[PDB]
Design an enzyme around this catalytic site. Sequence first.
Site, short mmCIF file in Angstrom:
data_model
loop_
_atom_site.label_atom_id
_atom_site.label_comp_id
_atom_site.label_asym_id
_atom_site.label_seq_id
_atom_site.Cartn_x
_atom_site.Cartn_y
_atom_site.Cartn_z
N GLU A 19 1.07 19.63 2.26
CA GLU A 19 0.52 18.30 1.98
C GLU A 19 0.33 17.60 3.32
O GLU A 19 1.26 17.56 4.13
CB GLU A 19 1.51 17.51 1.13
CG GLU A 19 0.96 16.21 0.56
CD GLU A 19 1.97 15.44 -0.24
OE1 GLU A 19 3.18 15.54 0.06
OE2 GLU A 19 1.56 14.72 -1.17
N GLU B 185 -1.70 5.42 -1.18
CA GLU B 185 -0.45 5.86 -1.76
C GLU B 185 0.51 4.67 -1.83
O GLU B 185 0.47 3.81 -0.97
CB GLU B 185 0.21 7.00 -0.95
CG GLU B 185 1.63 7.36 -1.41
CD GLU B 185 2.11 8.75 -0.96
OE1 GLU B 185 1.28 9.53 -0.47
OE2 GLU B 185 3.31 9.10 -1.11
O1 LIG Z 1 -0.82 18.21 -13.70
C1 LIG Z 1 -0.60 18.53 -12.32
C2 LIG Z 1 -0.86 17.31 -11.43
O2 LIG Z 1 0.07 16.29 -11.80
C3 LIG Z 1 -0.68 17.64 -9.93
O3 LIG Z 1 -0.83 16.71 -9.24
C4 LIG Z 1 -0.32 16.71 -7.94
C5 LIG Z 1 1.19 16.43 -8.01
O4 LIG Z 1 1.72 16.20 -6.70
C6 LIG Z 1 1.17 15.07 -6.03
O5 LIG Z 1 1.82 15.05 -4.84
C7 LIG Z 1 2.87 14.10 -4.68
C8 LIG Z 1 2.16 12.78 -4.36
O6 LIG Z 1 2.92 11.87 -3.59
C9 LIG Z 1 3.41 12.15 -2.34
O7 LIG Z 1 2.74 12.17 -1.36
C10 LIG Z 1 4.37 13.48 -2.69
O8 LIG Z 1 4.94 14.13 -1.54
C11 LIG Z 1 3.81 14.60 -3.57
O9 LIG Z 1 4.85 15.40 -4.13
C12 LIG Z 1 -0.34 15.27 -5.80
O10 LIG Z 1 -0.84 14.07 -5.29
C13 LIG Z 1 -1.04 15.59 -7.15
O11 LIG Z 1 -2.41 15.92 -6.90
O12 LIG Z 1 -1.65 18.66 -9.57
C14 LIG Z 1 -1.22 19.96 -10.40
C15 LIG Z 1 -1.49 19.69 -11.89
O13 LIG Z 1 -1.24 20.87 -12.68
#
Ligand SMILES: O[C@@H]1[C@@H](O)[C@H](O[C@@H]2CO[C@@H](O[C@@H]3CO[C@H](O)[C@H](O)[C@H]3O)[C@H](O)[C@H]2O)OC[C@H]1O
Length: 189
Positions: A85, A176
């Site tokens: 990420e 975010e």
């Molecule tokens: O249904 C699933 C989705 O919910 C999934 O989405 C991703 C989940 O993780 C997020 O990342 C977090 C966001 O916030 C911070 O930055 C954290 O470190 C992360 O853990 C992503 O943003 C989403 O895109 O995608 C998979 C799908 O099956």
Amino acid sequence: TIQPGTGYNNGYFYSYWNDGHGGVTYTNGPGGQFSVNWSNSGNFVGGKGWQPGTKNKVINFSGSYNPNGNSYLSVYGWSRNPLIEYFIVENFGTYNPSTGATKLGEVTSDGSVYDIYRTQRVNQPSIIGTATFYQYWSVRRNHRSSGSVNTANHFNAWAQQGLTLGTMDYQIVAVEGYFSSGSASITVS
Ligand SMILES: O[C@@H]1[C@@H](O)[C@H](O[C@@H]2CO[C@@H](O[C@@H]3CO[C@H](O)[C@H](O)[C@H]3O)[C@H](O)[C@H]2O)OC[C@H]1O
């Protein structure tokens, strides 16, 4: 206002994710525009861009960003294999996300020096399910809510420092928030 999820809107990919806590509304607008309004939210991330991203995209953003508490405005995306990420942070609220992280270099791009960091998430949500994965950060010294990001300068500097990316997944300009309030209106291109 829309459902957490992903899709296309006016020719742009978008991703909107939240932890289910409530207190955040995300709206897709004309062209590359999106808005976020939040009040005592949980954790969320949303914005517009591309699926997949590329390693040399020049990303333009413009608008307003008014956090009240913990929030970032960044170029945001993922790579697979390895799962990473990543964040090119152009502005933030009460918390610099690199606080306490080990500095791994500097890069000058698009009118500012950025400081580079690596952190790790352990058993957290990701694009492939619950996982442990690294996060890469470029944190802009000169905060702003409009500009241009030459992503190659960041990805190349990261690689040079040993922070390698796999195959690109999505790549967006994202707001975010983590348990905060605010408003934002951002147009991507
Ligand atoms: O249904 C699933 C989705 O919910 C999934 O989405 C991703 C989940 O993780 C997020 O990342 C977090 C966001 O916030 C911070 O930055 C954290 O470190 C992360 O853990 C992503 O943003 C989403 O895109 O995608 C998979 C799908 O099956």
